[PDB]
Design a protein around this ligand. Structure first.
Ligand code: FAD
Ligand code: FAD
Ligand code: IH0
Ligand code: IH0
Ligand code: IH0
Ligand code: IH0
Lengths: 411, 411
């Protein structure tokens, strides 16, 4: 009945709050105060699709549902190689239900407050092996939910589930006010620059109200791997507009008057996609269980990290509740992760890792056909809500052709 | 807001009831009266695992939860080729949450009564193309939920998703009272007879109270393809015991005093696993949407048909609710099925179709290792609740060995 969680993030707090509502005692370790999270740097573009949003709704945790702008579709654009400032692919499709991006600077601290108000024990410290040893002696289960924190490396990298050992994109975020709203519906506007990278943009909610989030991913060493010399917020805004001027002038038209939401609405960084083994053994021989990004870390190119966090925490919560008085031993830990991995996250991960590599011809054919076959475009858009639905037709040429034909027959 | 459903079965009635609760008008066609279903032949062994049961719970339709015996694990036995009346494999694993088998003779008629009481329009007729033409003119969406009925063949067989065009097992059911309860927990007791077939048995709820259901599947033309000469209920009980005496004497020990629950608690039959295209076009050019067994029909060897029916109806209900005022056109129909198929049922189907074929050596190695590696046995048992979790390790030798090793490391 006593559960410890190290890491006050999306998955950790969602899980902790669910556990409290089910009558558990929860101890949570945070390495930052709520206010410093609210006023510190952005951490994500956190676009959450309907299934993930519903997990939050069902826990009563959708506190921003009304104030957060909805994201109502997906758009895909590719520059025309032979026509200046034009697109050779330019289509959109509505999501069957809205997505929403609630800044973690808002959500995490408010969920920390809710966790305390609901009886959770919040302990402030940069937790290390010593805290894990203490927790495993006083609690029935200890989870590590520390995201990209250094303590996550306690869990052993799973080479067979990790095809990459190096970052595959250089990342940046810029939160802005004043962007012209997309008409006639909002979308994740995806701009695929062949051999260069990707620009994504969609509306969101941050600490100063509604905004849009510009998301940049660059092939390393390419023209969009361009944040090393950026050292001020003003330079970051400028480099953001420069990418749009240089590679997506149609989006630059929307950004004549953009300003940062705040000087901390910027980020630049990179990481290697990594899957880890879920059970870590401490020096004492006691065991801890890894949660969400600790065990499955994907590049954000597919916008799945916060979705994975919600769905991972939901699966772990269900597994804890079903266990009851049963031992929280390594076998149960491993089985809990396995259901998440084989049931769901292996397909999110395989899809994302394929998209990081150069697209093969059948993929370019799918993206083009989607502009002329609306049901295929819809499949693409709503696949973001459950990436299992891309298999087997996204990854195999012959199956992709069969699926295009299925889609064309009902257009 | 007006929906028609042809076929008053598990998926059709679950969907209809959900639609009524959401404020839709529902017309349903039934080819039998509730009472004739209650007192007619059994139709299934309908073992529903926790995720499917929860879909019913969330609609408030788990009316037998308290009276139906729980099924609390899975067991696997294989006869010893060199030791008389002994088993070379004999293991069991608990399900993380209970399964339950509520006879469709009970559930379907009670759900028909609930459907009328909740404002549904129940129309009694053996529906054909004429009723479909009428329904498609007076309703926004018409679904065909007719199971193994002849009208299901209106939907075009999908050859690429259907590796079989012939039955792969000869089936029989025998519902009995007086079987010795399994101790110390109930289970689906799976008896795999190499090259011959399978005997499954578990407790259930039928019209005369708790029982056990004996399920027989025989390789066609083999020793368990043995129901052609059976012509009375007494002969059916006798042939049931004969299989146990001949192939599973350890189960015969439990059946010294078994009697039929009723003369109609028996069934024999066979069918080819079949996947169909979900949109059918009527002579007028109007369109209908296929539901559950109409579009994805699997052999019962994996006990997934009623689970598929609950999960399919849940996905279709979610899709209808998200559509709102949107057109219920062929594109939307196809996309609704696609989410079900690519997201879930393709993996149930591939797994089941593999199990119907002779098991390759790595599969026999998995089944043996599970007897000595409890976490692998648990994976097997709980995979019945979500067969996606068998992939890729069940179907590939090298991956199966990796998963055995993962399981052994936490045993
Ligand atoms: C640029 C970018 C864009 C993204 N865009 C999207 C998107 O559009 N959609 C989407 O779904 N996902 C997106 N993601 C991913 C998403 O933000 C994360 O996957 C999600 O936050 C994972 O949740 P988590 O609970 O595993 O970790 P987090 O939410 O990161 O929580 C971990 C927390 O634990 C803390 N911590 C670390 N070490 C310790 C320690 N020793 N003791 C205590 N606390 C510690 C960390 O500081 C952090 O506060 C994006 C990520 C990035 C980097
Ligand atoms: C021997 C056997 C054992 C099984 N064991 C299991 C198990 O352990 N676990 C499991 O999950 N599944 C099992 N199944 C599968 C499960 O019973 C079915 O998959 C499930 O009933 C499918 O639901 P459905 O709504 O698609 O069809 P049904 O529940 O069969 O509903 C279809 C209904 O429509 C009626 N109908 C047909 N034609 C017409 C028409 N023209 N007009 C009106 N009505 C019509 C039919 O008579 C029937 O009443 C088993 C099946 C069999 C045969
Ligand atoms: C590169 S972005 O994530 C994408 C995903 C699917 C289809 C097209 C583009
Ligand atoms: C722009 S962020 O990386 C994203 C990408 C794809 C889908 C949703 C969100
Ligand atoms: C033949 S029965 O369905 C089965 C399934 C999984 C593992 C072993 C046996
Ligand atoms: C005995 S019925 O066919 C069954 C098989 C496997 C799992 C559950 C139910």
């Amino acid at each position: 009945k006593r559960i410890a969680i190290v890491g006050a993030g999306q998955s950790g707090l969602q899980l902790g709050l669910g556990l409290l509502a089910a009558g558990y005692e929860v101890t949570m370790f945070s390495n930052r105060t709520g206010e410093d999270i609210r006023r510190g740097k952005v951490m994500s573009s956190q676009c959450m699709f309907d299934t993930s949003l519903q997990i939050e709704r069902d826990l009563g945790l959708d506190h921003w549902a009304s104030d957060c702008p909805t994201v109502d579709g997906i758009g895909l654009a590719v520059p025309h190689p032979e026509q200046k400032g034009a697109k050779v692919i330019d289509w959109a499709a509505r999501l069957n239900a809205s997505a929403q991006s609630v800044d973690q600077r808002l959500k995490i601290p408010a969920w920390m407050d809710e966790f305390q108000k609901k009886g959770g024990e919040l302990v402030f410290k940069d937790a290390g092996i010593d805290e894990l040893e203490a927790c495993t002696q006083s609690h029935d289960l200890t989870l590590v939910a520390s995201g990209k924190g250094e303590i996550s490396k306690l869990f052993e990298r799973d080479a067979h589930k990790s095809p990459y050992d190096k970052p595959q994109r250089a990342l940046a975020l810029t939160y802005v006010k004043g962007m012209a709203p997309r008409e006639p519906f909002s979308a994740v506007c995806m701009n695929l620059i062949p051999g260069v990278g990707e620009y994504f943009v969609f509306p969101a909610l941050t600490t100063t109200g509604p905004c849009e989030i510009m998301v940049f991913e660059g092939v390393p060493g390419g023209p969009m791997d361009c944040w090393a010399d950026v050292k001020t917020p003003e330079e970051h805004l400028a480099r953001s507009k420069w990418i749009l001027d240089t590679f997506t002038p149609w989006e630059a038209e929307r950004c004549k008057d953009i300003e940062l939401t705040d000087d901390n609405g910027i980020l630049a960084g990179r990481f290697a996609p990594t899957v880890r083994k879920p059970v870590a053994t401490l020096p004492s021989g006691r065991k801890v269980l890894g949660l969400a990004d600790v065990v499955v870390l994907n590049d954000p190119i597919t916008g799945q990290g916060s979705n994975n966090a919600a769905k991972c925490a939901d699966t772990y919560l269900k597994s804890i509740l079903a266990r009851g008085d049963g031992a929280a031993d390594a076998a149960w830990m491993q089985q809990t992760f396995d259901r998440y991995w084989f049931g769901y996250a292996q397909w999110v991960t395989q899809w994302t890792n394929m998209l990081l590599a150069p697209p093969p011809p059948h993929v370019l054919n799918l993206l083009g056909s989607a502009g002329a076959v609306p049901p295929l475009a819809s499949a693409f858009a709503n696949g973001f809500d459950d990436p299992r639905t891309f298999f087997p037709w996204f990854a195999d040429a012959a199956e992709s052709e069969r699926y295009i034909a299925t889609c064309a027959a009902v257009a």
